């Protein structure tokens, strides 16, 4: 019935207690062939799956949030949903420590009655203790931590960068739908900038945390259970985060490469393919976790502007308030670090545009000729398998003379286009001399076929547009 006793006997799989699971698929279309106005679009999916297991937990609203080092919460789904349940009970003092530079042997402080406000003031002290020892400068470099990834889905990206999906959706304004319908290509970068961090020395036994007036039944009452094991916030990073979004409408498979080239500023950044992509991309940057609020957003077609934002935020002032960016918790029982577990599937995709064209035949040869034009019309069933529907031209196997012109329109889904023209030397078609034989002609907007010359010296040509 006691704190150490009740806790020391909790049955739970620490590697499953905290889990944020999402979407798992099996019923997906490997291939989608559809028309879109005058175009013919071809989507080609490929189920992909990611599995994250972070130990460092993100904090959403620094003002609404009062999490601190030493705090107590339950390892439940609320926590997983970025809104943990804090256990408020009269407790024992605890030692806290900041990692600002040049402060060894002076960085620790003891907080008698840990509470958000109580601990904060301690930290405040520590910082001032620093600002005192070091009066010349009050600004230091932030410790940035870079992360990057393409956006395929909410749960995907959310776990990839270990950030709450809503946050991006709100601040970066991510159009998860267009993304889904493959109408947009998006990449997100995250610059975690830590100024300093604070830890709370781990206790030998749970009891060391709580006062004596406290009993396990209280804890088991507040919510402590096998479904809500108790834990303590061991570390808290203070600083801010810069989120950068790289979006485009281009469907090229080079986008990613292009984005990276732009970000890193590599020499291959001028690949004309990239330049066009860049010309069709939009970049967004924002800085959260601070007290800046919404007033620091930037949308440009000029990345140099995004580069500045990052550069300008490479420092933090020891004379300004620093808010919680993230934290790592620890199970009371074994003092092991907690780690929210996430597993989810998603679908990488690609969509190739097509557009109808036509065959332009032109006969100006001093002989009689017969054409043979055929092609296939691609289709895709429910299982995403190819389905070729053969098509042929009317004017096939029909004589044609001095200057015959005609246009043969083709659907955007025309494949294996074959254009043949034979002269009339001797018996039947299947016995004549060839003026032109082309196979698998690339469906373009204009396939200009044309024969000419004499019976002995025929001539032909095919151009494109």
The answer for 223, left when phi > 0, alpha when psi is -120 to 50, beta otherwise, is left
Which residues lie below 8 Å from residue 26, measured CB to CB, with a gap of 6+? none
Q: Where are the domains of the chain?
A: 1-18+55-143+194-239+315-338, 19-54+339-355, 144-193+240-314, 356-465
Elucidated via: X-ray
Non-local CB neighbours of 428 within 8 Å, separated by 6+ positions: none
Query: Do 240 and 290 contact (CB within 8 A), yes or no?
Result: yes
**Four-way CATH pick for 356-465: 3.40.50.2300, 2.30.30.110, 3.90.950.10, 2.60.40.1430:** 2.60.40.1430
Tell me, in Å, the resolution of the deposited structure.
Answer: 2.9
DSSP 149-203: EE-S-HHHHHHHTTS-HHHIIIII---HHHHHTTS-EEEEEEEEEEEEEEEE---
Phi/psi class of residue 126: alpha, beta or left (left: φ > 0; alpha: ψ in -120 to 50)? Answer: alpha
Distance CA 442, CA 238 (A): 58
> Within 10 A of 24 (CB to CB), how many other CB atoms are there?
10
Contacts of 369 (CB under 8 A, 6+ apart): 363, 399, 400, 421, 422, 423, 424, 435, 451
Cβ–Cβ < 8 Å for 198, 123 = yes
230: Cα separation from own chain's centroid: 33
Determine the Cα–Cα distance for residues 137 and 318; give it in Å rounded to an integer: 9
- Report the relative pairing of strands 357-363 and 446-453 from DSSP bridges: parallel
Distance CA(238)–CA(223), nearest Å, equals 28
CATH fold of the domain at 19-54+339-355: Carboxypeptidase Inhibitor; Chain A (3.30.1040)
Lookup result for tokens 């984005």 = 259
Between CA 324 and CA 67 the distance in angstroms is 8
Helices (H), ranges, 12-51: 14-17
Q: Which two tokens stand for residue 386?
A: 């190819």
Strand pairing report for 315-317 and 342-348: unpaired
How far is the C-alpha of 166 from the C-alpha of 154, rounded, in Å? 9
Q: Which two tokens stand for residue 290?
A: 């601070």
Class of domain 144-193+240-314: alpha beta
Three-class SS of residue 60?
A: coil
C-alpha distances out from residue 433 to 275, 398, 403, 405, 429, Å: 49, 15, 19, 21, 9
Strands 230-248 and 72-74: antiparallel
Q: Which long-range contacts (CB under 8 A, 24 or more apart) does 47-50 make?
A: 47/345, 47/346, 47/347, 48/152, 48/345, 48/346, 48/347, 48/348, 49/343, 49/344, 49/345, 49/346, 50/156, 50/159, 50/160, 50/343, 50/344, 50/345, 50/346
């Amino acid at each position: 019935q006691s704190i150490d006793s009740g806790i020391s006997s909790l049955s739970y799989n620490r590697n499953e207690v905290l889990a944020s699971n999402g979407d798992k698929i099996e019923s997906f279309v490997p291939k989608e062939g559809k028309k879109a106005g005058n175009k013919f679009i071809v989507v080609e999916r490929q189920k992909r799956s990611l599995t994250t297991s972070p130990v460092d937990i993100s904090i959403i609203d620094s003002v609404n949030d009062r999490t601190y080092p030493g705090a107590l919460q339950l390892a439940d789904k609320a926590l997983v949903e970025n809104r943990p349940t804090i256990l408020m009970v009269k407790r024992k003092p605890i030692n806290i420590n900041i990692d600002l530079p040049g402060l060894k042997g002076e960085n620790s402080i003891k907080v008698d009655d840990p509470t958000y406000g109580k601990v904060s003031g301690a930290i405040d002290e520590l910082v001032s203790k620093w600002n005192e020892k070091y009066s010349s400068t009050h600004t230091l470099p932030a410790r940035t931590q870079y992360s990057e990834s393409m956006v395929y889905s909410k749960s995907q990206i959310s776990s990839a960068l270990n950030v709450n999906a809503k946050v991006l959706e709100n601040s970066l304004g991510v159009d998860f739908n267009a993304v889904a319908n493959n109408e947009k290509k998006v990449m997100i970068l995250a610059y975690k900038q830590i100024f300093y961090t604070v830890s709370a020395d781990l206790p030998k036994n749970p009891s060391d945390l709580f006062d004596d007036s406290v009993t396990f039944n209280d804890l088991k009452q507040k919510g402590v259970s096998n479904e809500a094991p108790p834990l303590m916030v061991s570390n808290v990073a203070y600083g801010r985060t810069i989120y950068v979004k790289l979006e485009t409408t281009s469907s090229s498979k080079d986008v990613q490469a292009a984005f990276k080239a732009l970000i890193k500023n590599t020499d291959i950044k001028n690949s004309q393919q990239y330049k066009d992509i860049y010309e069709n991309s939009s970049f967004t940057a924002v800085v959260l976790g601070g007290d800046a609020q919404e007033h620091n957003k930037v949308v440009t077609k000029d990345f140099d502007e995004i580069r500045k934002v990052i550069k300008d935020n490479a420092t933090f002032s020891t004379k300004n308030p620093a808010y919680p960016i993230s934290y790592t918790s620890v199970f009371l029982k074994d003092n092991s670090v907690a780690a929210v577990h996430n597993k989810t599937d998603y679908i990488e995709t690609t969509s190739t545009e097509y557009s109808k064209g036509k065959i332009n035949l032109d006969h100006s040869g001093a002989y009689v000729a017969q054409f043979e034009v055929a092609w296939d019309e691609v289709s895709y069933d429910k299982e995403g398998n190819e389905v070729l529907t053969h098509k042929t031209w009317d004017g096939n196997y029909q004589d044609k003379t001095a200057h015959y012109s005609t246009v043969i329109p083709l659907e955007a889904n025309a494949r294996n286009i074959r254009i043949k023209a034979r002269e009339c030397t001797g018996l039947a078609w299947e016995w004549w001399r060839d003026v032109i034989s082309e196979y698998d002609v690339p469906l373009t907007n204009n396939i200009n076929v044309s024969i000419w010359g004499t019976t002995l010296y025929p001539g032909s040509s095919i151009t494109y547009n």
